[PDB]
C-alpha cells in the first residue's frame, strides 16, 4: 500500500433507493469509489485526477435504504501517469425488517457485509502532478 | 449476440456535474448501464435482476454538462443464473465552450465519441426467471 | 418534418417517483421533452436555445418507478427565430406489480403505452442561429 | 374563481441549474405547477388528482440560479371529472449578476417579473371525489 | 420585528423521503429555512449572506411524503453585521393514509400543525451591505 | 462519552452546491448530522429514532465543491427516552481555487478545518429501546 487507507461513511437514505423493494443500485457504490480515488490522487500528487477504468468490479451483497455503508480505498502502485487502486465496499449498520416501512427498527452488522470488491485505476497527467499534500503519503514515489 | 441492442439516450444536465469545472463523474455511466443491464433483463427472463460485476470498464472521453449521451448493451451470453453482457457509451452532441457558461452554442459528435467500454454479469435466480418478454428475446435459451 | 427524429430512452428509477404510491409526476415528461428539444435545436442551429412554451400537453397514462420510457420528438416547421415541434412519449417496460415493493418481476409493453403527448417551440435569437450541425438536418432552412 | 388562490414560494438553488450557464429549466415550473394542482384537487374533493394536460404553456422570462420564485395556481371551473385551472410563475428575487460566481449581490423584483402562466386541467374520478376539504373551498359545485 | 416575514410554501415528494416510511428528515426543514434567511437577506441590505448558526431549532412534529408545508421567517432584530431571525415550519395539508401507497385520499390540516420553530442568524459584512431592496423593509435600520 | 465516536466521512460533489459560487449551504451540514445521529442511535439502542432539536449550531467556516468533510458526532448524556449528542463537522481536503473551474489543483488541509458544531438530543420512545447493538455500546444505559 501506498499512503494510508481512505474510508469514506455514510448513510442510504431514501434518496438513494433505484430499483423498487428500496434497492440501492450497484452504481451508487462506484459513485462512491469515484470519490475516494478522488481523494487518494489529492494526497498523492494534488490533482483530483481523472478516473480510467475498473479492472473488475464485483457487487456480492445487496445495499438497501437505511444502511449505513464504509468505503475503502488504497493505493497499490504509482506508476507513471496512473496509480493502481483497491476499493472495498462494507455494509456496517441496517434496518432489521426492509420489507415494513413502518418498523424503525435497526441494528449493526456484526461483524460487518462485504458488498463490493474492484480494482480501478486514476491517471495525472505528468504536468498536473505536484508531489504529496498529506503526510501519510510523503513517501510516495513514481519509477 | 442473443436478443436486440438496448440503447439508452439522455442529457447531461447541470444536475449531472460532479466534479468541479461541470465534469461528469465516471460513475454516471455505470449508473446508466445498470439501467440498461435491467432491461435486458426484463426482456430476457422477466426480473429486473442483481447485478454481479463488471470486467474491464474503460472510461475513454471525459463527460461533461450539456452532452448528449447514448448507451447501448446487449447480451453477449446467457448463463444458468447468469448473463453476461458487452456495454458502450457513446457521446453524440454537446457544448462548444464548456468552459464558458454563457456559451449556448452546441454541436454534434459527428463521428460519435466512444467514451466508456465495459463487460458486466447481471444474475436472476432460477425460480426468478420467467422466460423471454420481448419479441426479439424470445428464442433465448439457457444451457 | 425537419431533419430527423430525435428519441430518448431511460428508465425510471425510485428517484423520479413523485406522489405517493411511486407515482411519477407529469412534469417528468415535460423536462425530458424539454431535453428533446434542445438536442432539436443544436442539430438545427447549434445552440441550446430557450423553450417558449407549450401549444399542447395532454398526459394519457399514468407512469411508475420501474417503467422505461421513451421519448420523440421532431420539428415539424422552423420560423425567423422560433421552431414548432411535436413530442410523444411512450412506455416500453414496467415491473409487474408496483403495489408489492418485494416483486422483482417485470415485463415489456407490447404494443408499447402511449403516456403524452405535446406541440411545443423553442427560440434560437437570430445571431445564435449557427446553421445545422448534423447531417440530417442539413436542408433544415428559415422562411 | 372557485376557493382560494394556492400560492407556492421557494428558491432556486444551484440544484435547480439544468442548462449551461446556470440557467433553469421550463420545466421545473410546470414541475412546481404540478404540486400547486395537486394542492388545489386535495382542497376541492380531497384527493391528489391526475393531471390530463395543459393549454398555453408560455415561458416568458429566463430563469436562473438565486431566483426567488411564486407558483400561483387557482381553480377556474369544476367540472364533472375534470377541473380546470389557471397558473402563473413569478420572480420576486434574484442575484444582481449570475455571471459572477463570487457576487453575492442580489436584490428583489419589485413589481415581480412574470416567467410563465398556463392553463392545465386536473381529474378526480367520481368515486374519489370526496367533497371539499379546506374551508374556504366549502362551496364548490360540480354540475 | 422588522420587514414584513417571509413564507415558503411547497410540497413534499417522494424525493424529499430520507428515513424509511416515507419519513422526511428534519433537515429538510433546515435547508428551507436557510433559503427563507437568504430571501430576508437580500430584502434587508441585498446579499445573500451567511448562516452564522442557530440559538435553538425544535422539531415538533413528523413530516411525510405528501405533506404540504409552509415555512415562515422574519428579522427579528438587526444588528451591526449580523441579523437575529426567527422561523416556523407548519404542515397545511397531508395524504389521509400515508401507510397505504397506493391511497389517493389527501386533505388539508385545519388548523394548520406546527412541525418546526428555530432561532437563527445570519451575517452581511459591513461592506456588503447595501440597504433595503424590499418596500415592506424600508425602515430597516442598523443602530 | 457513552459508547464511541461516529465519522461520517465524504465529499462534496457539485450536486452539493446550493448557493451560487459552489457555496454549500449550513443545512448539508445538518443533514449529515441527522444520519450521523441516526447512526447512534441504532448502537445505542437499535431504533433510527427521531430527531428532537439542537442547541447551539455554529458554522463556522463555508464549505465548497470539492471539500472533502468529515462528520462527527457521540452520545454525551442518555436520558430517559432522549439522547444528548454533540457533533462537529471538519474540512480534510479541498480545491486550491475554487473560482476557477478548470483548475484541478487540490490538497489536504493539515490541520482540518472546523466548519460546525452543534450540540443536539434525539429521541426513542420508551418501548422502542432495545439495547445496544453494538459492542462498543454495551455499557450504555438509561437512569
Ligand atoms: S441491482 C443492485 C446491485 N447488485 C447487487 O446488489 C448484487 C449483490 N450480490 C449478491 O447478492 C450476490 O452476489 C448474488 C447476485 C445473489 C450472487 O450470489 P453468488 O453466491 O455470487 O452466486 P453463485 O456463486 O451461485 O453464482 C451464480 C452465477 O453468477 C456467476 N457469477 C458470480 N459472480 C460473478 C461475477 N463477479 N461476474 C460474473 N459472473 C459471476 C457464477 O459463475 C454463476 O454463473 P452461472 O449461474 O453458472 O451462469
Ligand atoms: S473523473 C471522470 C471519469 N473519467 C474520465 O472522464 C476519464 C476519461 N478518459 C480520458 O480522458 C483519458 O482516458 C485519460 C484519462 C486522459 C487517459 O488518456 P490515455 O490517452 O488513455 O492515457 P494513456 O493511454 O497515455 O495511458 C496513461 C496511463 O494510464 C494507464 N492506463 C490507460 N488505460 C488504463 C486502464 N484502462 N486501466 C489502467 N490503467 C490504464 C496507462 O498504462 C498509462 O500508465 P503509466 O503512465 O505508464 O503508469
Ligand atoms: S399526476 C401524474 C400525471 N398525470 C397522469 O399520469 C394522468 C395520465 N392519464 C390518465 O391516466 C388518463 O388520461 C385519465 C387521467 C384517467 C383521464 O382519462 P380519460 O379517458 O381521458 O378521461 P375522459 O376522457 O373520460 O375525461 C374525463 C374528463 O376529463 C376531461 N379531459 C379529458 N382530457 C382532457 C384534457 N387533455 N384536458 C382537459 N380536460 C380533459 C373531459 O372533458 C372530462 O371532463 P368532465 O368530466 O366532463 O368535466
Ligand atoms: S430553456 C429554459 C426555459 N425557457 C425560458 O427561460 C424562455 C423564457 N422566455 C424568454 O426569455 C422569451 O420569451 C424569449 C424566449 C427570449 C422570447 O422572447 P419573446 O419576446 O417572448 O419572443 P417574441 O415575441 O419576439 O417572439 C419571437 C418568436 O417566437 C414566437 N413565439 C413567441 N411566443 C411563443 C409561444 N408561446 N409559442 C410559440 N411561439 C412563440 C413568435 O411567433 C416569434 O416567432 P418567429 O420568430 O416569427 O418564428
Ligand atoms: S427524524 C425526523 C425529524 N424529527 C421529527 O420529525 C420529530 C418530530 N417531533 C415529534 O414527533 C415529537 O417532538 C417527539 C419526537 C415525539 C417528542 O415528543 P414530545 O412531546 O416533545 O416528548 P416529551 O415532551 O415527552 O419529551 C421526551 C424527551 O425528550 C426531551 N425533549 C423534548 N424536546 C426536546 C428538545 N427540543 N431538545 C432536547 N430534548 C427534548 C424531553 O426532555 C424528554 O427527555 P427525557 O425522556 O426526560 O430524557
Ligand atoms: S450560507 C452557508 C452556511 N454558512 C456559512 O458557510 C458561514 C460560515 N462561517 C463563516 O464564514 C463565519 O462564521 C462568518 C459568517 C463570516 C462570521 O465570521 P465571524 O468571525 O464568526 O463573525 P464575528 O465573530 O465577527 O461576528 C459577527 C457578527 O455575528 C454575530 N455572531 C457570530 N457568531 C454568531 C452565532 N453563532 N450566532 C449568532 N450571532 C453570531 C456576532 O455577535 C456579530 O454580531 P454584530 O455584528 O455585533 O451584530
Not at 440501492?24 to 478522488?38: E, H
Not at 479492472?55 to 455503508?69: L, N, W
Not at 493502481?84 to 457485509?113: G, L
Amino acid at each position: 500500500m501506498v499512503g494510508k487507507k481512505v474510508v469514506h461513511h455514510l448513510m442510504m437514505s431514501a434518496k438513494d433507493a433505484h430499483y423498487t423493494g428500496n434497492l440501492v443500485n450497484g452504481a451508487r457504490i462506484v459513485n462512491q469509489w469515484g470519490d475516494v480515488g478522488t481523494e487518494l490522487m489529492v494526497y498523492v500528487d494534488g490533482d483530483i485526477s481523472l478516473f480510467l477504468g475498473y479492472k473488475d468490479i464485483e457487487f456480492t451483497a445487496p445495499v438497501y435504504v437505511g444502511d449505513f455503508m464504509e468505503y475503502h480505498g488504497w493505493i497499490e502502485k504509482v506508476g507513471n501517469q496512473s496509480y493502481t487502486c483497491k476499493f472495498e465496499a462494507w455494509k456496517v449498520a441496517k434496518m432489521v425488517d426492509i420489507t415494513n416501512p413502518q418498523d424503525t427498527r435497526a441494528t449493526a452488522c456484526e461483524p460487518p457485509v462485504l458488498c463490493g470488491t474492484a480494482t480501478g485505476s486514476l491517471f495525472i497527467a505528468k504536468d498536473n502532478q505536484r508531489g504529496p499534500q498529506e503526510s501519510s503519503f510523503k513517501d510516495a514515489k513514481h519509477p
